[PDB]
């Protein structure tokens, strides 16, 4: 039985411009087993109705998923992705950085 911890990237579909509608993405990849929990957060709180891709896998059999929601970035609002997986002793939070 192998266990692989998820790689996590949080980013926008389009270059971030304050006040303009965009898409917030959390891409989780490289993980095994496939059971995973992913929340998108606005100022610490869970965003509702976040959608996700259908489970698929890479050449090395590790899984990947995209979680996504419409959002409008501002100067003040903090966005993040929160991930729980069996490999993690506590959920991992990755903050959205418009420069990454």
């Amino acid at each position: 039985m192998i266990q692989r911890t998820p790689k996590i990237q949080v980013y926008s579909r389009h270059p971030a411009e304050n006040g303009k509608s965009n898409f917030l993405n959390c891409y989780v990849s490289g993980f095994h087993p496939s059971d995973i929990e992913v929340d998108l957060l606005k100022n610490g709180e869970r965003i509702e109705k976040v959608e996700h891709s259908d489970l698929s896998f890479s050449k090395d059999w590790s899984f990947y998923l995209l979680y996504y929601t419409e959002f409008t970035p501002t100067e003040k609002d903090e966005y993040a992705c929160r991930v729980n997986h069996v490999t993690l002793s506590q959920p991992k939070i990755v903050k959205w950085d418009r420069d990454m």
Partner: protein, 276 residues
């Protein structure tokens, strides 16, 4: 150029929470075109690309039939694997299968694929010859003996050389506007001071298709392989992909660094510098 079709399958057992979940997706190159999920309210093969929607009711019925049968076979296989590995019925286990074909610019088979993994590890794979098997362990050797007896490789070869290639070519023609269009990356370099002494140069590639791309940093024309942070190519959500490569550079030395971009959507590989 060259194209691929792949079907991916994942069954995950969940004892005490019903039958194993079955999810399968089909791709042509980096374009998702069909999906089936056993946990859907009314499980059927569903279109995920515009060019597959034109297929008639007979197509969708047959595909759905195959998906349902595969979900059933996977469940029997998961039970079998518990026996092969002397495992308890209490735990959750994962069975994966990928199969498919590559075609060249001539449209004939370049390579066929059919492979399985159990619990994230290679189990059994059809060799490139499409006639012999590689089994990972003594459990998979039992499967190999059964499949050799039933001439499974011959059946898979017939499909991979025939229908797989034929239907791939059909999809490529029907979806030509997108599947046969390469979108080049939109590229730029950003500068992110870290300290008085160093700054990050980040080379961006955005909005490209297909996913295959090469981003490299050079210093004085020397590849900065060990010193480059390269993120995994990631989906934008609009069919296209994004990637970046970053290096930490001594302040004042930014002009010794060049970013190089290779993508089939570009006539010539690009060279980029940070422009203050």
């Amino acid at each position: 150029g060259s194209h691929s079709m792949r079907y991916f399958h994942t069954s995950v057992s969940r004892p005490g929470r019903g039958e194993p979940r079955f999810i399968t997706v089909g791709y042509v190159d980096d374009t998702l075109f069909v999906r089936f999920d056993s946990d859907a309210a009314s499980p059927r093969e569903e279109p995920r690309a515009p060019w597959i929607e034109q297929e008639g009711p007979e197509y969708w019925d047959r595909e759905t039939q195959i998906c349902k049968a595969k979900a059933q076979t996977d469940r029997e296989d998961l039970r079998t694997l518990l026996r092969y590995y002397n495992q308890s019925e209490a735990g959750s286990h994962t069975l994966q299968n990928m199969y498919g074909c590559d075609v060249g610019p001539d449209g004939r088979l370049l390579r066929g694929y059919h492979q399985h993994a159990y619990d994230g590890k290679d189990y059994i794979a059809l060799n490139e010859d499409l006639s012999s098997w590689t089994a990972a362990d003594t459990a998979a050797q039992i499967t190999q003996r059964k499949w050799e007896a039933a001439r499974v490789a011959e059946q898979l070869r017939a499909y991979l050389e025939g229908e797989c290639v034929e239907w791939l070519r059909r999809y490529l023609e029907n979806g030509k506007e997108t599947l046969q269009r390469a979108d080049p990356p939109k590229t730029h370099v950003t500068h992110h001071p870290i300290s008085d002494h160093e700054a990050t140069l980040r080379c961006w590639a955005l909005g490209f298709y297909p996913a295959e791309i090469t981003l490299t940093w050079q210093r004085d024309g020397e590849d900065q392989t060990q010193d480059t942070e390269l993120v995994e190519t990631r989906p934008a959500g609009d069919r296209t992909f994004q990637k970046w490569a970053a290096v930490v550079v001594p302040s004042g030395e930014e002009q010794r660094y060049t970013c190089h971009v290779q993508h089939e959507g570009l006539p010539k590989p690009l060279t980029l510098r940070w422009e203050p």
